[PDB]
Design a protein around this ligand. Structure first.
Ligand SMILES: CC1=C(CCOP(=O)(O)OP(=O)(O)O)S[C@@H](O)N1Cc1cnc(C)nc1N
Ligand SMILES: CC1=C(CCOP(=O)(O)OP(=O)(O)O)S[C@@H](O)N1Cc1cnc(C)nc1N
Ligand SMILES: [Ca+2]
Ligand SMILES: [Ca+2]
Lengths: 676, 676
């Protein structure tokens, strides 16, 4: 249609004008993908006035540098984003940052820009939708039937994380996922011939995806719409639509790397405008006939949501218990008193590894909290992440599970697991999802973990085998730097529970979270139940385990080293030194407590020694002296490794005594004090 | 042959017995892969008495958990590893750690165990061999003609890093790479049907690999040998050999996940021995006829190396300059006085971004040091990593470069780039290789970076756009935690040079390195040349830039914040406060200096404030108070972001004045002091 052509030109020119105003950003992919964006958004069901409608189709821009395109679509459709915001693209404090951020941009489902992430997030949105539909849909009640549309480029296809997620999505037969490859044969280094000559289509067929090819995606919106219709008929395979485009279509510099990532020249923008019937003297034009056309689609979508709300009301009458559960989840509330299922321990109970305590927690809470789902990256019998009696999330056609299942076999795919977890969280409906691996291999997923923090998603890593305590697998498996890395990242709760009560507190935090990802660092080896622990105290992140009013020293420790500190206190008593013990299961939670609470744990006037069998980085926030492990580990039986490195009651006591001596005659204030 | 069958049984039983003695480790893949290991090592050229022969074939065990297999081969072939070492498998301090470590195990080319790494390392060994051969071979002088053999399993094939490297290896037409997939249909979570149902062979064809399938790799060594011969005929494609095996072949528990990763039962070991003609009462048997057979292959290989040494002598006569260059490289020596090519600056010179200073360094040193090669992960015009006038490393058949080229187009593949760099270093011949990306995306490669440190490889990351100084791309691109992460990892030199002289010092360190990987954190934005910098002083890692004998405070800073500190010193002077400035371009190098040198930089008796626009973790090693950035960044013009966060001369001065006030009346000792 004439109006469709005008809409595509409007999108292209809004994106170009936004880049021009900022004198920064990426015009090439927006120019190339405007036809496809127009066609996809016309097929999508969404409400710009209710961005959280649970049955909306989701869109993800994995090639996030192309965000001037996304912002233009959101503005044209009347989301809470305006032309005035587009004029502030890439400007400090604006609603139009240089890559899309879900916390800041209405209609941005996830935070993209780091390549490869968005397609994996789309896999997770689609996984969640399938699980959600299997859980709630009934005959005559299609509560959930939405699609997940993803745009990606060559860069996303080169990043290994996307291969992981695409292999898994094909295995999982995720037929409501429809991805679109911007096949423009250009990246920053020039032609894809220099580095990216694989047969992408053949690779996607090998994963079990359906393929549709659109040879002229610069103009053929009829074929793009038809490709979507075709994809919707293939209910047991995710679909990749090859969009053969010209990067920067219409620019004098189209088809070149120079159009990827810098503003166009002013004369180039003028010729674009006149070629397309726009005024070359005008910027940020929005023809009223485009607004009218887009408004008609919004109004239709709002009537669809209106009818869905009536369907949901009827569902609550026909299926009273499921309807109440669904309502509670859409309200963002956990079941009343769910935390009464958390296991509680006493000091008379047996020693247990915190990985096994975690298994026990999951066993108790999964039956009580339906919005918990999770999995492991091929470490299920090691991480202990599956509750007995649950069914795996698999397509029923495989015989290996069902979409109503609760447990995901991620395979050896940590990075994609992390990004898929972000997508499950992004779906909404109160999903509280988790992923297991060895702590040292959470590092394989750092790209996604950082985005969990920036995106404010309440995902959880069940990160077992946390230290040299794992023993014989040796230094390639033993974390040193890992907790420092994640603790140094803003907005990550890094729990390292010492015992049963602390493990329950860690899960209480992880499941109640709405804005903060969690990493639970858990042991291979057994640890005793501590005298003085409780869920109540551990929920403060740091607490006084052993109070000593006339302390010569306080030992602050985490995880497996708390019991070590308690044993060292006894050695010290025989040397005439009185120690207190602080357990610090989560530094972030502790930091968020009141100043007075924190000072009650780490007071002035007493030296404080930290003990944790990994990097000492960060620990000066809480201690004057630090006993840690700042070298790689060793392959041997774990107790022998602890002895080698002097992580023994006597080794801790020796360092505590040296700390007391070092501060003799000195005035000591809390590590919590600072000059500014 | 009868002896070949006996050798295969010997290998299997040595591996099983090693696992049994440790009561730890992985018997399954060794049992399944013994026939293939026997066949491959019989085809390989190697000298157990000269592990560094530059024309040896290389073997890499990417499925490193299977290392009892590797250790058995090395023992049988008379490497510096014995049956007594096998009896100490997985025991503290042994030469047979639970995953292979190149620093500890003769004949282990790389450190494997973290899945996916070894195949990528093999790509790098093969890349280096092709570059090396193109550089040195002449008519009648095949100085380098060796192959790279890699074993991998399902786990390596699931990890995205291997997809990245396999796509690139296919593009690069690396015909001397021969990989073998242990197609046993089992991983830790059980059948591969639960998570890994892709058509692997079709995927590898899509990358441009050649395929050979061996349907009965439990017995058919004739077919495995024939597959190697076939692979050698295909000179323009890497080859994947599908070895269809039974995990744990021969065990009562063969073909099950239980055989993957735990010792066999004692009765199972007895029946293995009698089925294969061994004494069930005996462990660690080495039949003398197996030793004889293997010794004959060693003796033949040693005669091949003897002839290669004569070829090399003749090459030095026929090609005097190339021969001397090759000899120098094989001696591990850089060119005499190579560092005279490093650029030197004065304070009268213009401000320059450290990414551009890096380009200039590379431009000067690449022509002087032939063993430097490197590339970028699709960021060549941003990282500024290519010297003008050099040719890319590409197969000549593409027309895009040649194997004699110096510059690698890695594509958007940071993790594989990191692991490929490790393989290039592992090849030897003094290669000093580098890889560019944005600092924030070095994190995508953490799995490989950690292994650079553990493996002691002198690789270099050219990690540009280091901070909020990059501006508009925003918080998804702006490092916060990244330097803390890598500084907390043992054995990583993390240079953050402030100016031209410091950038030259950083490269001097990176290129001279033999055992320590480097990360060079470089700016987008221009920085002034500093009064007081030099290569000499910056080579100490930390140095006094501005000495103030009556200092009220010392400001320690890195990178872009050194100039900020110098400007703050001027503000402070107007407030009656005298400051000194320390520049700390590499914390690891500084830490390695003498205690007296370090105390001359960070003396007792004066408060010290650190300034660096990223995490404060680690900084308490060097300072009493820390001014850093412990939250995510922002999308805007960089100077506006610095102002927002008060990284301005006045903001630094305010915090310095507060630091002076906080220590009034207190006794202050160097942050370098400690109790133990
Ligand atoms: C290489 C790179 C880009 C080119 C994309 O090439 P692609 O074909 O995807 O984009 P097109 O040129 O528009 O067609 S964008 C810039 O982000 N980036 C840096 C970049 C690198 N690594 C990661 C993980 N995320 C990034 N963001
Ligand atoms: C999952 C896993 C393994 C199964 C391999 O399954 P694969 O098919 O490769 O082995 P096979 O069972 O012998 O046939 S090993 C153990 O390392 N590991 C943990 C592991 C996880 N992630 C990373 C990066 N490295 C690892 N090392
Ligand atoms: Ca592209
Ligand atoms: Ca396997």
């Amino acid at each position: 249609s004439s109006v469709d052509q005008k809409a595509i030109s409007t999108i292209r020119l809004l994106a170009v004008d936004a880049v021009a105003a900022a004198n920064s950003g990426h015009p090439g992919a927006p120019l190339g993908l405007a036809p496809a964006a127009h066609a996809v958004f016309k097929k999508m069901r969404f409400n710009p006035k209710d961005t959280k409608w649970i049955n909306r189709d989701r869109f993800v821009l994995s090639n996030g540098h192309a965000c001037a395109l996304l912002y233009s679509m959101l503005v044209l459709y009347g989301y809470d984003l305006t032309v005035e915001d587009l004029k502030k693209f890439r400007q400090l404090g604006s609603k139009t940052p240089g890559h899309p951020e879900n916390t800041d941009v209405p209609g941005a489902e996830v935070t993209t820009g780091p390549l490869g992430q968005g397609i994996c997030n789309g896999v997770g949105i689609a996984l969640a939708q399938a699980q959600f539909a299997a859980t709630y849909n009934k005959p005559d009640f299609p509560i959930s039937d939405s699609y997940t549309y993803v745009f990606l480029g060559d860069g996303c296809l080169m990043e290994g994380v996307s291969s992981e997620a695409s292999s898994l999505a094909g295995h999982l037969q995720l037929g409501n996922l429809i991805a679109f490859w911007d096949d423009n044969k250009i990246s920053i280094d020039g032609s894809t011939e220099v580095a990216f000559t694989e047969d992408v289509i053949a690779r996607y067929k090998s994963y079990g995806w359906h393929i549709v090819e659109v040879s002229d995606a610069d103009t053929d919106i009829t074929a793009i719409a038809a490709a979507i219709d075709e994809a919707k008929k293939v209910t047991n395979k995710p679909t990749l639509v090859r969009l053969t485009t010209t990067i920067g279509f219409g620019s004098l510099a189209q088809g070149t790397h120079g159009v990827h990532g810098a503003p166009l020249k002013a004369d180039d923008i003028k010729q674009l405008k006149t070629k397309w019937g726009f005024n070359p003297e005008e910027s940020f034009a929005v023809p009223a006939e485009v607004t009218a056309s887009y408004n008609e689609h919004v109004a239709e979508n709002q009537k669809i949501q209106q009818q869905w709300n009536e369907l949901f009301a009827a569902y609550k009458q026909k299926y009273p218990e499921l309807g109440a559960e669904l309502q509670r989840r859409l309200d963002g509330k956990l079941p009343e008193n769910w935390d009464k299922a958390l296991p509680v321990y006493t000091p008379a109970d047996a020693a247990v590894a915190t990985r096994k305590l975690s298994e026990i927690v999951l066993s108790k809470i999964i039956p009580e909290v339906p919005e918990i789902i999770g999995g492991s990256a091929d470490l299920t019998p090691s991480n202990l992440t599956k509750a007995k009696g649950t069914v795996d999330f698999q397509p029923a056609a495989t015989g290996l599970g069902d979409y109503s299942g609760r447990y995901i076999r991620y395979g050896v795919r940590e990075h994609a697991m992390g990004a898929i977890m972000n997508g499950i969280a992004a779906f909404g409906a109160n999903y509280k999802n988790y992923g297991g691996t060895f702590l040292n291999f959470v590092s394989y997923a750092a790209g996604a973990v950082r985005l969990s923090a920036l995106s404010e998603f309440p995902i959880t890593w069940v990160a077992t085998h946390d230290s040299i305590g794992l023993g014989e697998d040796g230094p390639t498996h033993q974390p040193i730097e890992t907790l420092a890395h994640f603790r140094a990242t803003p907005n990550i709760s890094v729990w390292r529970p010492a015992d049963g009560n602390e493990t329950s507190a860690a899960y209480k935090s992880a499941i109640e979270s709405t804005h903060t990802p969690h990493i639970l660092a858990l042991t291979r080896q057994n640890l005793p139940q501590l005298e003085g622990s409780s869920i109540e105290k551990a929920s403060k992140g740091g607490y006084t385990l052993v109070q000593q009013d006339k302390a010569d020293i306080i030992i602050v420790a985490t995880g497996s080293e708390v019991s070590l500190a308690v044993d060292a206190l006894k050695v010290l008593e025989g040397q005439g030194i009185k120690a207190g013990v602080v357990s610090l299961p989560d530094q972030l939670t502790f930091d968020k407590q009141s100043e007075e609470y924190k000072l009650s744990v780490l007071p002035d006037g007493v030296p404080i020694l930290s003990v944790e069998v990994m990097s000492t980085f960060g620990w000066s926030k809480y201690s004057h002296q630090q006993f840690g492990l700042n070298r790689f580990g060793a392959s041997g039986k774990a107790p022998e490794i602890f002895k080698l490195f002097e992580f023994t009651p006597e080794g801790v006591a020796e360092r505590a005594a040296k700390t007391v001596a070092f501060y003799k005659g000195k005035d000591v204030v809390s590590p919590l004090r600072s000059a500014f």
